[PDB]
Design a protein around this nucleic acid. Structure first.
Ligand code: NA
Length: 348
DNA sequence: CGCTAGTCGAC
DNA sequence: TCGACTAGCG
């Protein structure tokens, strides 16, 4: 998503061990463990052969967290945002290409090419994720499938005070306003923690350590919701937001030529895309597990009409969102593939 | 030379 | 493929 973010604010990082969060709750972006565990199963998953290695791989980290008296909440990605469905189609298409090519290379003889094609065509299905869910629930670990992107859901869990930290490899969590993010954690619990409050330890940020300005910077530098203007990265965006002190971000973006001491004419499409990206960071749908219902990541302000935020996620019935969050309902087909009932401690 | 982004290198 | 590294842009 946001390239070079970690290195840009590395001064706010600190090497920790997760035993720090003993007796507390930590949410997990399970996609990193799942992906790192599916790497080994590449050849065997490509051939459609039964695998459980990635399951035990995730259960390594889970049992590790449990051994240090930590309550982990495994969070999974859900439906793809309407604006990214085409990109998803492209990804699956390319993975299919490398899959078939991997088969042809398997028939030719070269095993290196075939396996390297298989590891570059890994498709984390929902069946695998559900296997991880069952394996985790058998150990008493709560699971949660996000309505859409897992990042937003995790960010909500942290903001709601449900969890104290987020384990992930995606630094984009910082743009979602996460307080504590644990990156690069190994199987033993050694990680690199970034705290929002420590953002001020980054001199190059200046006064851009507030959530809003930090978000603006991250978006302007280039994110998954909106590609940056040509020649604009973290340093340029940060400099622009430092030299400017106007709450109206749009007018600031329009005067991006002034702050960069040149002649820049910003397209209106990029402005609308910026508004949509910001609104997606702010109000993307997530699942409240306490009230058991769909809510925006942050409460709607006075200058936003919820009916115009279809790109940030579409509402469905709360019981449907519940069945999805439990992993009982398939994301794509909406078929009930499981009948787990939490009522028979995340869902009070 | 600061900085972005194309490309290297591990998976 | 994807994050890190640095060639080369401005
Ligand atoms: Na950029």
């Amino acid at each position: 998503g946001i390239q070079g973010l970690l290195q840009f604010i590395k001064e706010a990082s600190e090497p920790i061990h997760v035993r720090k969060y003993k007796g507390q709750v930590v949410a997990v972006d399970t996609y990193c463990w799942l992906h790192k565990g599916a790497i080994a199963c590449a050849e065997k998953l490509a051939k459609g052969e039964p695998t459980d290695r990635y399951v035990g791989f995730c259960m390594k980290f889970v049992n590790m967290l449990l051994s240090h008296g930590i309550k982990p909440i495994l969070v999974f990605d859900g439906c793809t945002l309407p604006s990214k469905k085409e990109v998803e189609r492209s990804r699956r298409e390319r993975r299919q290409a490398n899959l078939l090519k991997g088969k042809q290379l398997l028939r030719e003889g070269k095993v290196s090419e075939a396996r390297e094609c298989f590891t570059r065509s890994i498709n984390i299905t929902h069946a695998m994720a559900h296997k991880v869910i069952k394996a985790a629930r058998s150990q008493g670990v709560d699971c949660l499938v996000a309505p859409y992107e897992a990042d937003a859901q995790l960010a909500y869990l942290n903001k709601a005070g449900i969890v104290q930290a987020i384990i992930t490899e995606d630094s984009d969590l910082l743009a979602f306003g996460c307080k504590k993010v644990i990156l690069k954690m190994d199987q033993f619990g050694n990680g690199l923690e970034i705290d929002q409050a420590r953002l001020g330890m980054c001199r190059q940020l200046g006064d851009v350590f507030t959530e809003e300005k930090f978000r603006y910077m991250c978006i302007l530098s280039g994110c998954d919701y909106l590609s940056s203007l040509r020649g604009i990265g973290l340093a340029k965006a940060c400099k622009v937001l430092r030299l400017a002190n106007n709450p109206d971000i749009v007018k600031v973006i329009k005067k991006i030529g002034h702050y960069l001491k040149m002649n820049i004419t910003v397209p209106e499409d990029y402005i609308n895309g910026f508004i949509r990206a910001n609104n997606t960071f702010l109000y993307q749908l997530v699942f409240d597990p306490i009230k058991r219902k769909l809510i925006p990541l942050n409460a709607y302000e006075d200058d936003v009409d919820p009916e115009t935020l279809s790109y940030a996620g579409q509402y469905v019935d709360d019981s449907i969102a519940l069945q999805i969050a439990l992993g009982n309902k398939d994301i794509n087909t909406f078929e009930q593939i499981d009948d787990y009932n939490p009522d028979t401690n995340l869902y009070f």
